[PDB]
């Protein structure tokens, strides 16, 4: 449901290429004219071939066609809606009622579900259906799995925000180490689990586990094509730095951690810096 042909036409004309330059050795003229008219659907193979002809990135072409936004399908709208609800909680009840029963349909809805649970937990909104199902839910979703997808790592990231570590860890362990990258998004979620779990393991003083997460993150850095998140790399190093302060009791590490956190302020990540300073204080107790 995207006007890819129009974008091909748009780029073609912008680069002063003639229709010929594109369709020749691929399809007939009349057919190609149908592509740019957006009357005939285009194959992935076809679009890949046209992306070569123009010299403009295949994925960029897609984004320009309308894949860059999330509102492309039901799921995305619902994920954008989480923000609305987080800020405007009075709209919780109405929506959670529509989401809750759909939670086991796709891994995407389940992600959303955990999102609502986090909103609820934050505002002390009663969610009795949660405590009564999560276990059977996760047992349903994961007991028979072998490989894991970006959405899975997303789920687990969020799962950690709403279940005690001791319940989630059994699911995390099979999902690592990572061996390959499957996009900037896959990259993001595989890192978030790490970052989230490292945070919790530190908070709770499970130093053993905490190191596991640090090491896992370091391994990511060795994967070819992996797109490490700059701000993640900083936050995790601060956590790593606090880990070294807790194990070796050497004060230099603490300073480093602080020095890292402040860098966030110095680069204008105001709210993230505030979040981190609260967390540091927190760490230095329970």
């Amino acid at each position: 449901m995207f006007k890819i042909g129009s974008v091909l036409k748009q780029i073609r004309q912008e680069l002063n290429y003639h229709q010929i330059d594109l369709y020749s050795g691929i399809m007939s003229k009349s057919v190609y004219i149908k592509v740019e008219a957006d009357s005939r659907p285009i194959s992935v193979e076809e679009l890949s071939k046209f992306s070569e002809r123009l010299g403009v990135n295949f994925f960029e072409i897609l984004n320009r066609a309308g894949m860059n936004t999330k509102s492309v399908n039901e799921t995305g709208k619902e994920k954008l809606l989480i923000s609305k609800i987080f800020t405007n909680p009075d709209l919780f009840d109405k929506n959670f009622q529509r989401i809750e029963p759909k939670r086991l349909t796709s891994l995407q809805y389940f992600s959303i579900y955990l999102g609502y649970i986090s909103i609820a937990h934050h505002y002390n909104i009663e969610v009795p259906t949660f405590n009564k199902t999560i276990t059977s839910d996760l047992k349903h979703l994961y007991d028979k799995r072998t490989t894991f997808f970006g959405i899975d790592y997303e789920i687990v990231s969020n799962l950690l925000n709403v279940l005690p570590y001791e319940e989630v860890s059994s699911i995390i362990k099979p999902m690592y180490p990572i061996v390959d990258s499957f996009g900037k998004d896959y990259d993001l979620t595989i890192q978030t689990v790490l970052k989230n779990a490292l945070t919790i393991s530190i908070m709770n003083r499970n130093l053993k586990e905490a190191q596991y997460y640090i090491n896992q993150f370091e391994h990511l850095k060795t994967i070819k094509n992996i797109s490490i998140n700059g701000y993640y790399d900083l936050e995790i190093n601060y956590l790593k730095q606090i880990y070294q302060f807790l194990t070796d009791k050497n004060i230099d590490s603490y300073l480093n951690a602080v020095n890292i956190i402040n860098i966030f302020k110095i680069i204008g990540k105001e709210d993230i810096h505030r979040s981190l300073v609260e967390e540091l204080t927190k760490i230095s107790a329970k």
């Binding site: 994920k79 989480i82 992600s111 959303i112 955990l114 999102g115 986090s118 970006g150 959405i151 997303e154 990231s157 969020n158 950690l160 925000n161 998004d185 993001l188 979620t189 978030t192 970052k195 989230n196 945070t199 919790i200 936050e235 993230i272 979040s275 981190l276 967390e279």
Partner: peptide, 7 residues
């Protein structure tokens, strides 16, 4: 920090 993520 424990962050939520929605792709």
């Amino acid at each position: 920090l424990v962050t939520l993520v929605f792709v």
